[PDB]
Design an enzyme around this catalytic site. Structure first.
Site, PDB file in Angstrom:
ATOM      1  N   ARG A  65       0.813  -1.230   0.000  1.00 31.00           N
ATOM      2  CA  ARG A  65       0.000   0.000   0.000  1.00 31.00           C
ATOM      3  C   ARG A  65       0.840   1.270   0.000  1.00 31.00           C
ATOM      4  NH1 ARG A  65      -3.722  -0.940   4.759  1.00 31.00           N
ATOM      5  NH2 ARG A  65      -3.166  -3.164   4.838  1.00 31.00           N
ATOM      6  N   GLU A 102       8.861 -11.445   6.052  1.00 33.82           N
ATOM      7  CA  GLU A 102      10.111 -10.741   5.742  1.00 33.82           C
ATOM      8  C   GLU A 102       9.981  -9.684   4.636  1.00 33.82           C
ATOM      9  OE1 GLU A 102      13.270 -14.294   6.990  1.00 33.82           O
ATOM     10  OE2 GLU A 102      12.278 -14.323   5.036  1.00 33.82           O
TER      11      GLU A 102
HETATM   12  N1  LIG Z   1      -5.605  -1.625  11.343  1.00 27.28           N
HETATM   13  C1  LIG Z   1      -5.056  -1.605  10.114  1.00 27.28           C
HETATM   14  N2  LIG Z   1      -5.757  -1.128   8.990  1.00 27.28           N
HETATM   15  C2  LIG Z   1      -5.175  -1.122   7.776  1.00 27.28           C
HETATM   16  N3  LIG Z   1      -3.915  -1.552   7.556  1.00 27.28           N
HETATM   17  C3  LIG Z   1      -3.173  -2.033   8.602  1.00 27.28           C
HETATM   18  C4  LIG Z   1      -3.699  -2.069   9.898  1.00 27.28           C
HETATM   19  N4  LIG Z   1      -2.748  -2.538  10.740  1.00 27.28           N
HETATM   20  C5  LIG Z   1      -1.681  -2.806   9.974  1.00 27.28           C
HETATM   21  N5  LIG Z   1      -1.894  -2.459   8.689  1.00 27.28           N
HETATM   22  C6  LIG Z   1      -0.908  -2.658   7.566  1.00 27.28           C
HETATM   23  O1  LIG Z   1       0.241  -3.315   8.104  1.00 27.28           O
HETATM   24  C7  LIG Z   1       1.387  -2.451   8.116  1.00 27.28           C
HETATM   25  C8  LIG Z   1       1.513  -1.751   9.453  1.00 27.28           C
HETATM   26  O2  LIG Z   1       1.568  -2.737  10.481  1.00 27.28           O
HETATM   27  P1  LIG Z   1       2.765  -2.692  11.542  1.00 27.28           P
HETATM   28  O3  LIG Z   1       3.904  -3.497  10.917  1.00 27.28           O
HETATM   29  O4  LIG Z   1       2.168  -3.357  12.777  1.00 27.28           O
HETATM   30  O5  LIG Z   1       3.085  -1.241  11.775  1.00 27.28           O
HETATM   31  C9  LIG Z   1       1.156  -1.421   7.039  1.00 27.28           C
HETATM   32  O6  LIG Z   1       1.825  -1.867   5.852  1.00 27.28           O
HETATM   33  C10 LIG Z   1      -0.366  -1.377   6.910  1.00 27.28           C
HETATM   34  O7  LIG Z   1      -0.725  -1.306   5.523  1.00 27.28           O
HETATM   35 MG   LIG Z   2       1.004  -2.823   4.029  1.00 31.17          MG
END
Ligand SMILES: Nc1ncnc2c1ncn2[C@@H]1O[C@H](COP(=O)(O)O)[C@@H](O)[C@H]1O
Ligand SMILES: [Mg+2]
Ligand SMILES: Nc1ncnc2c1ncn2[C@@H]1O[C@H](COP(=O)(O)O)[C@@H](O)[C@H]1O
Ligand SMILES: [Mg+2]
Lengths: 173, 171
Positions: A65, A102
């Site tokens: 994204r 990863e």
């Molecule tokens: N609640 C959420 N809504 C949408 N995307 C999320 C959500 N939590 C995690 N993500 C996705 O996962 C990654 C962030 O998760 P993190 O590694 O825990 O910071 C990003 O690439 C986001 O696109």
């Molecule tokens: Mg993502």
């Protein structure tokens, strides 16, 4: 802030997706409304120029994204965009790091000393962004900042990335 | 010269991911801002000259199509809708095999006209699934476009009768 409102009104929230407990924040409507997308990119670009002046060499976009925002942000800043991918997707010699899974980067993506800003759609735990910073550090690049549209503050991702600075357009618990 | 700016930034890797194939890496196009700008401008000029005011939305394909969709849409003054790998999108969806792609049911309304964009056309399986999904929303696919086309895999023929356009061709 009118522009920030154009972004906030285009985030939709879905309780208990994809699993019970998670509240999914969907940026899809930001992409579909060209004024919203333009606002998001402009706000991020203005912040980055105001904070770093001419010191940014590259934007790094995170699979998948982050890919939606990285190239347009880079273009607005007059910069190139480098890619950090889920493992197994990139050709040539790579390095990889756990993000939860990863992430990977090409060994020749950056030269030592080059200055990079990382972009993703959303910061949650900070695992994904932290893996990206580790990979960039292993190429001896300097990460100036990580940025996102959305930050989930209860998950303390900002603290996880410290001392690398972090900035988000919007915050939810 | 614009097309040359794009061509000179495609890097080819033999035997990835399997022996005998050549991987076309668009990463250097993204890394050189002039090359990326040229690619988006060439795609936009094609689409405007071909479709005039008929396009309502760009649809970008997960994941590498995401790199080009939003910038192309922005250049045309349009929004970008997303077609994702199954399991990624919330709300009511349709899906199609080929692995599976998925689209949100409210992504488009019946009668809306879309151009699909991805980085590369190979067998055409991925783009074909996208077109199926969009047709099931009663959207009209005006064209599919890519930066690169691998002509020996006959993707164009698979997509027919949906029109197709690529900036660059390799066997
Ligand atoms: N609640 C959420 N809504 C949408 N995307 C999320 C959500 N939590 C995690 N993500 C996705 O996962 C990654 C962030 O998760 P993190 O590694 O825990 O910071 C990003 O690439 C986001 O696109
Ligand atoms: Mg993502
Ligand atoms: N030789 C290749 N080099 C780079 N990407 C490829 C290659 N073949 C297939 N792809 C990717 O796979 C999709 C096209 O496969 P297909 O469904 O066979 O047209 C696109 O999203 C491409 O990014
Ligand atoms: Mg793909």
């Amino acid at each position: 802030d009118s522009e920030l409102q154009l972004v906030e009104q285009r985030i939709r929230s879905f309780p208990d997706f994809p699993t019970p407990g998670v509240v999914f924040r969907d940026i899809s409507p930001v992409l579909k409304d060209p004024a919203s997308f333009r606002a998001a990119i402009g706000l991020l670009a203005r912040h980055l120029k105001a904070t770093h002046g001419g010191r940014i060499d590259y934007i790094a976009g995170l699979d998948s994204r982050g890919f939606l925002f990285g190239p347009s942000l880079a273009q607005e800043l007059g910069l190139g965009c480098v890619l950090i991918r889920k493992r197994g997707k990139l050709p040539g010699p790579t390095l990889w790091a756990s993000y939860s899974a990863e992430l990977e980067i090409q060994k020749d993506a950056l030269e030592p000393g080059q200055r990079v800003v990382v972009v993703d759609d959303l910061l949650a735990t900070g695992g994904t962004m932290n893996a990206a910073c580790e990979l960039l550090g292993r190429l001896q690049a300097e990460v100036l900042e990580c940025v996102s549209l959305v930050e989930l503050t209860s998950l303390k991702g900002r603290e996880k990335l410290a001392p690398v600075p972090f900035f988000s357009l919007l915050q939810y618990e």
